[PDB]
Design a protein around this ligand. Structure first.
Ligand SMILES: Nc1ncnc2c1ncn2[C@H]1C[C@H](O)[C@@H](COP(=O)(O)OP(=O)(O)OP(=O)(O)O)O1
Ligand SMILES: [Ca+2]
Ligand SMILES: [K+]
Length: 430
DNA sequence: ATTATGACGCT
DNA sequence: AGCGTCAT
């Protein structure tokens, strides 16, 4: 009891831009605003591949990884915006730059960890302490939480969505004011007030809307964020965990959506995260390893200690192109021309990164896929990255991969290559 | 022919 | 070092 950790020491948020690439395109082109629309890359094969979908289009069943020609069958009036193509490949610069806009705003409020192009974790513990000092015992008004859901509420003894949201918020605040909750619950509530302010600043200063989760750790904040999308935020308290986890499929928890989660389900014969509480820590470690077992034991009780890392910039800068089916690269000249295209994009991005961020990459990683191999990468080799020069990088990448060509004819490449990837890594200050 | 990324773990 | 997993 009095010595059992409860993982309530931090306030962590996860902010996730709504349908991010779509919003970037809708800001630029007002004709796309408030419409079913999607972002596509390429166009020739089946209309292009959809990579982002507005909520209006999701209502018709349009999803990521769908061909645009197929999405048009579900939604004939679907509008499309195409990712820019440069040097023969998709170029994501517009979205990376829009991401920097949002990350820089978030950084004014607290330390952030860039989790993805449109996702960041926020460690709000210190900001919450400061705001509590400012509040000076003053109650928190529902007006400060206009887009917040309290997971699990309302409960106990309105048929519209917003009505339910307000009922749950009122129950939560009523119990905080009466002193029937805990200090961690108050800390989370102040965290949610700050996240409302952060999200309002993002929308004011960029036009972009987002969703957010507020809880005591990264996994719960991530889970919380997805509960009420789009343009809403969700507070998951420690006390909400048993009910929330009691019907939560294991695959919904970050890191458990793949083979490990499937093995947890199969080996233990369970379905929901809460069912993990019935195993000892040693049992879980025996099946899933020391690290995973301790993580699962704490996580199923709502406890996780992974820190929000102070990192706003990506740690690698990479450029990749697939060459599917009949387009697989089958001559040496083809391989060299495409390595050059990739290296030219990489050089441009690296030179900009060095000027903006006072750092230089020192390692070049070259990865390829051969036709027939089921794995995304068939081979990875590294070499020194000593000059930001596209011809040198493309020649070096060729040097490190040239021995993979089985073909007895030097001019021919076999087996054909279905993917090329260049990645700059190992940054040092400059 | 579900593409272009990006972080992190294992040995 | 090179490979594998998980995720957006
Ligand atoms: N598999 C992918 N391939 C290519 N681009 C992707 C992929 N997944 C995500 N992206 C890009 C497009 C998305 O706009 C952006 C953020 O991804 P993600 O958060 O999963 O979805 P989303 O922002 O489009 O919608 P949501 O509102 O559900 O968050 O990253
Ligand atoms: Ca998103
Ligand atoms: K995201």
């Amino acid at each position: 009891g009095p010595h059992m950790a409860t993982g309530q020491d931090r306030v962590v948020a996860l902010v996730d831009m709504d349908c991010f690439f779509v919003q970037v395109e809708q800001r630029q082109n007002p004709h796309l605003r408030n419409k079913p629309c999607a972002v596509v890359q390429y166009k020739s094969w089946k209309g292009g591949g959809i990579i982002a979908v507005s909520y209006e289009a999701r209502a018709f069943g349009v999803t990521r990884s769908m061909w645009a020609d197929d999405a048009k069958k579900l939604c004939p009036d679907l509008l499309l915006a195409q990712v820019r193509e440069s040097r023969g490949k998709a170029n994501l610069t517009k979205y990376r730059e829009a991401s920097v806009e949002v990350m820089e705003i978030m950084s004014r409020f607290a330390v952030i960890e860039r989790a993805a192009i449109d996702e960041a974790y926020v460690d709000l513990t210190s900001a919450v302490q400061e705001r509590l000092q400012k509040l000076q015992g003053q109650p928190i008004s529902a007006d400060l939480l206009p887009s917040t859901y309290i997971e699990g509420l309302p409960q106990g003894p309105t048929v519209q969505k917003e009505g339910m949201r307000k009922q749950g918020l009122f129950q939560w605040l009523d119990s905080l004011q009466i002193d029937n909750l805990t200090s961690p619950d108050l800390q989370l509530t102040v965290g949610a007030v700050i996240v409302e302010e952060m999200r309002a600043a993002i929308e004011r200063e960029t036009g972009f809307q987002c969703s957010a989760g507020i809880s005591h750790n990264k996994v719960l904040a991530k889970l919380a964020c997805g509960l009420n999308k789009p343009n809403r935020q969700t507070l998951v308290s420690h006390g909400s965990v048993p009910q929330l986890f009691s019907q939560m499929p294991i695959r919904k928890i970050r890191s458990l959506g793949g083979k490990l989660g499937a093995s947890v389900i199969e080996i233990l014969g369970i379905e929901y995260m809460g069912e993990l509480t019935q195993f000892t820590e040693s049992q879980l470690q025996s099946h899933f390893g020391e690290k995973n077992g301790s993580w699962l034991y704490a996580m199923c009780r709502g406890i996780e200690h992974d820190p929000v890392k102070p990192r706003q910039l990506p740690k690698t800068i990479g450029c990749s192109k697939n060459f599917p089916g009949k387009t697989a690269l089958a001559t040496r000249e083809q391989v060299q021309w495409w390595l050059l295209q990739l290296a030219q994009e990489l050089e441009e991005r690296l030179t900009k990164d060095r000027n903006d961020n006072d750092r230089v990459a020192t390692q070049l990683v070259v990865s390829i896929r051969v036709q027939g191999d089921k794995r995304l990468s068939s081979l990875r080799r590294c070499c020194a990255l000593t000059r930001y020069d596209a011809h040198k990088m493309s020649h070096d990448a060729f040097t490190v991969i040239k021995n993979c060509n089985t073909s007895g004819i030097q001019t021919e490449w076999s087996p054909p290559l279905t993917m090329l990837f260049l990645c700059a890594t190992k940054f040092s200050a400059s």
